[PDB]
Amino acid sequence: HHHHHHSSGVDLGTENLYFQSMKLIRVENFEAYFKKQQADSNCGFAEEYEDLKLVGISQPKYAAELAENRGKNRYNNVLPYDISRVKLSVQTHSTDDYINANYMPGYHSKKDFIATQGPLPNTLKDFWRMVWEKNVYAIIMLTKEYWPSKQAQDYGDITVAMTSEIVLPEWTIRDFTVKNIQTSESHPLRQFHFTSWPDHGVPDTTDLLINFRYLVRDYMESPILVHSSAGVGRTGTFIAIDRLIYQIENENTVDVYGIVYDLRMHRPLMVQTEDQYVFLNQCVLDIVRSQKDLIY
Ligand SMILES: [Cl-]
Ligand code: NI
Ligand code: NI
Ligand code: NI
Ligand code: NI
Ligand code: NI
């Protein structure tokens, strides 16, 4: 009974959704389209990106604005929308449910990812609770510590213990156990840490992002938790490329505009600069160029 179509003049956000929330390009036409869009200092891509700027930002975020939850946001202007926020269980009051995090769609489902900020000192117990309560098995950390290394640490009613650390040049892979001290139930956890993605910036090469993503997929119901400082820019770019690669492999099509549109509908600022958006397109170009008769 929830399936309905809106009349005009009811929600201008929904009208935009129906009208222009997609720009689908077949891979066979993508090199020609990329050439057009990158001309004159990326004018075409800049227009796509500026058309995305107000998407999603009219949605309510009352929980995020509660006085009780102010200390739980890193920035007073990066706030989770109510509709997609990760709601935690409650012990003492309703606001116990709050964390600056959102469910983000991936290629396969609407809860494929949780996008969140790197924990604060006062939200560290909440962050590991989320990991526990939402059955997270993979964490993706994009930066340029909230976990133990030496011995087990308790964060609230959860104990975390490190079981492996492999340091590589571009990234680190850490394994943990996450154990509810009240119930004794333990889950495994793998953390994939990309170690030089600059804030507001992009990795040094497209291979680094693509190969890191494929590392995440080869080394993994349950959400993938992605975080960065604000939980939007690098986090959104990561999720986007993952969605794009699946769309290229399974469909023969690309929709960077539509995937970022969809991200913005679930959390603010996803893919936070124009260069990150252009970078997603250069990633696609390089994937397309690498996947590419005698006459008698
Ligand atoms: Cl950082
Ligand atoms: Ni229904
Ligand atoms: Ni439905
Ligand atoms: Ni219908
Ligand atoms: Ni409606
Ligand atoms: Ni900054």
Author numbering: -21 to 0, 1019 to 1140, 1151 to 1226, 1232 to 1303, 1308 to 1311
Quoted from the paper:
Protein tyrosine phosphatases (PTPs) play a critical role in regulating cellular functions by selectively dephosphorylating their substrates. The ∼280 residue PTP catalytic domain consists of an α/β structure, and biochemical and structural studies have led to a detailed understanding of the catalytic mechanism (Barford et al., 1994; Zhang, 2002). Key features of the domain include the PTP signature motif, the mobile Trp-Pro-Asp “WPD” loop that in the closed conformation positions the conserved and catalytically important aspartate residue, and the phosphotyrosine recognition loop. Here we report the crystal structures of 22 PTP domains, including two tandem-domain RPTP structures and a detailed structural comparison of this protein family.
In the first category are TCPTP, SHP1, SHP2, BDP1, LYP, PEST, PTPBAS, DEP1, MEG2, and GLEPP1, which have a “PTP1B-like” accessible pocket that harbors a basic residue corresponding to Arg24 of PTP1B. This pocket has the potential to accommodate pY at the +1 position as in PTP1B or potentially other acidic or phosphorylated residues in positions N-terminal to the substrate pY. The new structural data and analysis presented here suggest that a secondary substrate-binding pocket, similar to that found in PTP1B, is present also in SHP2, BDP1, LYP, SHP1, TCPTP, MEG2, PTPBAS, DEP1, and GLEPP1. Surprisingly, sedimentation velocity measurements showed that all single-domain RPTPs studied (IA2, IA2β, GLEPP1, DEP1, and STEP) were entirely monomeric in solution, as were tandem-domain receptor PTPs (RPTPα, CD45, RPTPɛ, and RPTPμ).
